RNA sequence: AGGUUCGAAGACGAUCAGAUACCGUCGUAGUUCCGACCAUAAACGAUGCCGACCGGCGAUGCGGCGGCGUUAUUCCCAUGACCCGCCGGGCAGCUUCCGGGAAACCAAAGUCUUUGGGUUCCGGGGGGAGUAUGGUUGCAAAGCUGAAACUUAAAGGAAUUGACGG
């Protein structure tokens, strides 16, 4: 069980925040990785330029040629 | 080991009354337990208990009147003030309309009602319903 | 693969790149 | 799924049980895990029970017995037909099987 | 092989063994006689096996009580049932064999030192209860 | 029953003692507990007459508080007792189930034979579990005959007196149609019943084979 | 054209028993369904949650059944929940109005606090179970509606329930579970012992031995 | 029920088990509500008037309905005190 | 059986009880007076003696410790202690 | 130190389409003992410890207590071996609509939306990955601590029907 003392609010936060590292939300969230590794670097938004235009092919159960842009 | 006495005696007559027993017998006695089980005895969720006195802590064997549902208890005894005692009292209550809370107070050991009436704060202990 | 050969090529593979790395 | 209460032994209080070799392969198994059958069986054939007894130079010669305890694992009980697989319900007795003594 | 009786034949022929019991007889003819004007079978194959049934069944029930319901079988069952009554029941014995426990019951329930009752000797061992296990 | 009139009389005990019905098995029910007197050395619990009385009376109050005799079901699936829930049912005007009792009598409403009774008395407990597993479907108050191993997790009158007996069985049937037929107005409590209880005893058939032929003999000599 | 067999159908149909609340005291069980139609008749709501085709695999493919849900009730304090898996989704949907017919319970409404006039809310707060789903409900003051998923709503809406609150959790996805986890819910407002209840119970004549002159007569 | 203005808001009263004090519900058709009969006090014959005693399907599932309706006669006077 | 009466229980039970679950503890030991043959001082013996008891008249033993109780000695005589 | 047997590696004979295997023959390290390391197992009850309560039953192990009797010697009790019980602590078992649970099942995995006896460890979709790197321990093998990028819409558990089974 959890402990229930009146002066264990220490160990409450203190367990409470070591276990909030443990789901992807609060991880990438807070982690700042996944904000370095994200291109946008956190903006909504961005300009670029256009290097090439390119196929994707689709998924497996599908089959057609996405048209997208290097950029 | 156990810690706290109140706590085994209210599971005890919990599990008692579930079972649909007549008479619960609570091995350690307090002063806590009687005070309680004398608000609960007010309020006519139990009937008559007797206190067979070794020279240790004693025993009690309640009457079990069949008409008790819970009769929990608030482990750390949190301090409730009349500000919070709402919140308490919808947080462990089935209803408004009936269930008490017991909290032992300066006035004495007394139900969430009369703490109100006479305009005191105290420490929480169980509730019963 | 079974876990247990998947643990050992693991550990095969490690001292590999143990060596390897010793080697600089 | 735990398919059985005590998990095919009858190992309760114990850590350790030393282990015996199955008398059909000689595989390590646990002893309180193997199937055991104690034979005890006629020295003789119950067919050449006869011609013994007329070869016999004894009159009442009480034909000797053959004292043999086997341990199998699972695997050689069930290929050897010793046990079975039963049902769901029926594993759970424990009563061995009747003699047939008519 | 391949002579076993389906529901149509065994349900009508105990059927009309419970209507006509009195008319029918043991002969396979006689009674493939009496069932054409006793029923209506649409198949003389099917009323001659049937007939041929009624025969077994006859034969059964002359020699015990087959599940079939008749008279006769049930008034003998009757007065075999609701009489027999001996002239001296089996509960009026002149003298009980009672047990000392069972004579201490009966003084605490104030029936004890009655004149019908003779006090056994208790036995001695506790022997009962089968041993356990098997051998 | 604490009347006076309502008491055990000498004769009743002679009965019970010699049909034995107070021998009970070399197991005890914990809910049975209360009705043993002793056990003895023989490891058979013997059990309290008086309270077996009790229990008795408390039945045939409760029989007699149906105002339809029709309403009250009598079973015996064991053949030591359909004879004696027979004789019952023909003497208290109840309702008589002998026998292989079919599932779904209390409970399935479509066939033919579908009945709701008001109360559901039972010669063995173990015997008879079926119909008392159904009268908890449909609200049935259940007098049963229990033993001192019976189970009673269905029973609400169970009378402590035997169910392996068949003198036992037939005795105490005999004696509870004695006592509902005294409740109501059909015997005036003074003269015995004029009902033998061997009426009520079920007979192996190897004497039924031969005791009949037995007495034409002694009648023809 | 109704021809009962039944003692209590039989009452129910010559004018014997006058409320549903006298079979429910005596918690006689309603073995067909032409009996609460004579009592609750023409205000029986009826309503289809939904159908859901099982299906079980068989050697030439897999052969689809229609299972159908159906909670039905006056707005007035009965409710009943009815499943029901046939061949066909009408005969499935009649069976189920059939079978919700049947399990029609009584709702107890009390006061969230201050009784004044009629009842709104359930009188405490009560927990229905059924699979992995739990169902809470908690007495709300008049005027704030039942809040609540759908299915649960409507459910709580034909019991005559006019404010609740209301907490679920399991997998609520399951449309039967999360039903019949409410509908225990409902069914054990009586169930719950509450302090008004204390008094102690007069006995009445059960139906069967006040009219049992009559049953004789009539109910062969 | 029995709100401010006095008059009792419900549909109907359940009863409750002589034995266990539980309130015996709509759909519990397990529960039981038998009549005892009582006799005359000199002729021990029935004389119409009887009492009713009120079991729970929890109680005569778990199996004390027996001592429970034994207990209730024995209260009542219906078993004699020296049972 | 749900209505035990816990706070009379007959001494049977009260005896076939642990000394610590009893009602209230009761010591299942108890003092004896002890007589030596060929002496005439009584001796006070713990009916669980743990030690050789010896008389200071005469070189004998009186009981011999045991696992429950004290084992007396033959021909030595012994009664209770009030009860 | 010792090395009988068995037997990783290895050799050979078979089998096979191939057969670095399953089978057979031999056989090194090891398996044995003493001393020093390692600290890992489906190290399992896949189930923390302490405490209280909540059904029944028959057994079993130890200790104690009380009883008809049988048995051992002896002249009787003790003391052993049985028989019948009671108590306490254990290994468990059967049964149950106590109750719980997704169910299998569990008298604990119960006394949980009627949620609080005290306390420790620990999980947060599947992979990447127990991987990289850093630190630390070790003679080594490795042990402990332990990511991220990226990828993915399921992966899983229990049960039901069918199909299939060398
Ligand atoms: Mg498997
Ligand atoms: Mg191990
Ligand atoms: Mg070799
Ligand atoms: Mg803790
Ligand atoms: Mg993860
Ligand atoms: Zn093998």
């Not at chain 9, 070189?59 to 696992?67: D, R, W, Y």
Request: with cysteine; proline share 5%; aromatic share 8%.
């Amino acid at each position: 069980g959890k402990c229930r003392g009146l002066r264990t609010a220490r160990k409450l936060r203190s367990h409470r925040r070591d276990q909030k590292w443990h789901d992807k939300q609060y991880k990438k969230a807070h982690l700042g990785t996944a904000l370095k590794a994200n291109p946008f670097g956190g903006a909504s938004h961005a300009k670029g330029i256009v290097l090439e235009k390119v196929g994707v092919e689709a998924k497996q159960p599908n089959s057609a040629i996405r048209k997208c842009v290097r950029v | 080991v156990r810690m706290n006495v109140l706590a085994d005696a209210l599971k005890s007559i919990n599990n008692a009354e579930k079972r649909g027993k007549r008479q619960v017998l609570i091995r350690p006695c307090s002063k806590v337990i009687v005070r309680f089980l004398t608000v609960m005895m007010k309020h006519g969720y139990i009937g008559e208990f007797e206190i067979i006195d070794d020279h240790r802590a004693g025993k009690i064997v309640v009457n079990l009147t069949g008409r008790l549902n819970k009769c929990g208890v608030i482990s750390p005894r949190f301090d409730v003030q009349l500000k919070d005692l709402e919140k308490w009292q919808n947080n462990l209550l089935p209803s408004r309309q009936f269930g008490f809370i017991v909290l032992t107070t300066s006035a004495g050991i007394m139900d969430h009602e009369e703490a109100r009436r006479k305009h005191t704060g105290g420490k929480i202990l169980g509730f019963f319903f | 693969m079974r876990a247990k050969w998947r643990k050992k090529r693991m550990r095969r593979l490690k001292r590999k790149r143990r060596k390897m790395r010793q080697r600089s | 799924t735990k398919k059985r209460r005590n998990n095919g032994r009858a190992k309760k209080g114990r850590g350790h049980v030393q282990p015996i070799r199955c008398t059909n392969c000689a595989r390590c198994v646990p002893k309180d895990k193997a199937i055991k059958k104690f034979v005890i069986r006629n020295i003789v054939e119950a067919a050449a029970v006869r011609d013994i007894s007329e070869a016999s130079v004894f009159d009442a010669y009480v034909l000797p017995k053959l004292y043999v305890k086997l341990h199998y694992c699972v695997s050689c009980a069930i290929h050897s037909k010793v046990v079975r697989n039963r049902s769901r319900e029926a594993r759970k007795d424990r009563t061995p099987p009747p003699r047939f003594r008519p | 092989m391949g002579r076993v009786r389906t529901k149509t034949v065994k349900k009508a022929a105990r059927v009309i063994i419970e209507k006509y019991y009195t008319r029918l007889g043991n002969d396979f003819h006689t009674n493939k006689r009496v069932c054409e004007e006793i029923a209506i079978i649409p198949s003389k194959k099917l009323r001659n096996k049937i007939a041929g049934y009624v025969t077994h069944l006859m034969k059964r029930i002359q020699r015990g009580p087959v599940r079939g319901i008749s008279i006769k079988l049930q008034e003998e069952e009757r007065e075999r049932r609701d009489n027999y009554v001996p002239e001296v029941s089996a509960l009026d014995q002149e003298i009980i064999e009672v047990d000392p426990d069972t004579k201490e019951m009966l003084k605490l329930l104030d029936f004890g030192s009655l004149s019908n009752l003779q006090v056994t000797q208790p036995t001695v061992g506790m022997n009962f209860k089968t041993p356990r296990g098997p051998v | 029953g604490a009347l006076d009139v309502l008491q055990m009389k000498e004769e009743d005990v002679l009965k019970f003692l010699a049909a034995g019905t107070h021998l009970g098995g070399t197991n005890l029910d914990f809910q049975m507990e209360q009705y043993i007197y002793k056990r003895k050395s023989d490891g058979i619990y013997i059990i309290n007459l008086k309270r077996t009385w009790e229990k008795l009376l408390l039945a045939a109050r409760a029989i007699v508080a149906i105002e339809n005799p029709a309403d009250v079901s009598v079973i015996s699936s064991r053949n030591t007792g359909q004879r004696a829930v027979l004789k019952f049912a023909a003497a208290t005007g109840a309702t008589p189930i002998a026998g292989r009792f079919t599932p779904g009598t209390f409970t399935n409403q479509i066939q033919a034979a579908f009945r709701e009774p008001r109360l559901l008395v039972v010669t063995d407990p173990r015997a008879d579990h079926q119909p008392l597993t159904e009268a908890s479907y449909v609200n049935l108050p259940t007098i049963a005959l229990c033993n001192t191993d019976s189970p009673l997790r269905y029973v609400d009158i169970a009378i402590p007196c035997n169910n392996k007996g068949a003198h036992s069985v037939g005795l105490m049937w005999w004696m509870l149609a004695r006592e509902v037929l005294r409740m109501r107005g059909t015997i005036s409590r003074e003269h015995p019943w004029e009902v033998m209880p061997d009426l009520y005893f079920y007979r192996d058939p190897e004497e039924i084979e031969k005791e009949e032929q037995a007495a034409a003999e002694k009648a023809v000599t | 054209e109704w021809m009962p067999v039944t003692k209590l159908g039989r009452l129910v149909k010559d004018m014997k028993i006058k409320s549903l609340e006298e079979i429910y005291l005596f918690s006689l069980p309603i073995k067909e369904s032409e009996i609460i139609d004579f009592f609750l008749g023409a205000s029986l709501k009826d309503e289809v949650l939904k159908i859901m085709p099982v299906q079980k695999q068989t050697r030439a493919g897999q052969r689809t059944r229609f299972k159908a849900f159906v909670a039905i009730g006056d707005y007035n304090g009965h409710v009943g929940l009815g499943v029901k898996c046939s061949k066909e989704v009408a005969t499935a949907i009649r069976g189920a109005i059939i079978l919700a017919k049947l399990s029609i319970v009584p709702v107890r409404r009390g006061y969230w606090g201050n009784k004044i006039g009629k009842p709104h809310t359930v009188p405490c707060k009560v927990t229905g179970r059924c699979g992995s789903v739990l169902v809470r409900l908690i007495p709300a003051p008049r005027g704030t509606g039942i809040v609540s998923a759908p299915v649960p709503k409507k459910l709580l809406m034909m019991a005559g329930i006019d404010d609740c609150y209301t907490s679920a959790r399991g997998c609520t996805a399951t449309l039967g579970n999360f039903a019949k986890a409410t509908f225990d819910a409902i069914s054990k407002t009586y169930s719950y012992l509450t302090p008004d209840l204390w008094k102690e119970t007069v006995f009445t004549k059960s139906p069967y031995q006040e009219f049992t002159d009559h049953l004789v007569k009539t109910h062969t | 029920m029995q709100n401010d203005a006095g008059e009792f808001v419900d549909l109907y009263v359940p009863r409750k088990c002589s034995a266990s004090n539980r309130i015996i519900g709509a759909k519990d058709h397990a529960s039981i509500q038998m009549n005892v009969a009582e006799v005359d006090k000199v002729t021990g014959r029935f004389n119409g008037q009887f009492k009713t005693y009120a079991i729970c399907g929890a109680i005569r599932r778990m199996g004390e309905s027996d001592d429970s309706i034994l207990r209730l006669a024995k209260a009542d006077g219906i078993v004699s005190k020296n049972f | 059986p749900l209505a035990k009466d816990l706070l009379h229980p007959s001494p049977e039970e009260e005896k076939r009880k642990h000394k610590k679950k009893r009602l209230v503890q009761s010591p299942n030991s108890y003092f004896m007076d002890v007589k030596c043959p060929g002496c005439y001082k009584i001796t006070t013996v713990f009916s669980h003696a743990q030690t050789v008891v010896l008389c200071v008249g005469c070189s004998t033993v009186l009981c011999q410790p045991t696992g429950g109780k004290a084992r007396l000695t033959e021909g030595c005589s012994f009664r209770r202690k009030q009860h």
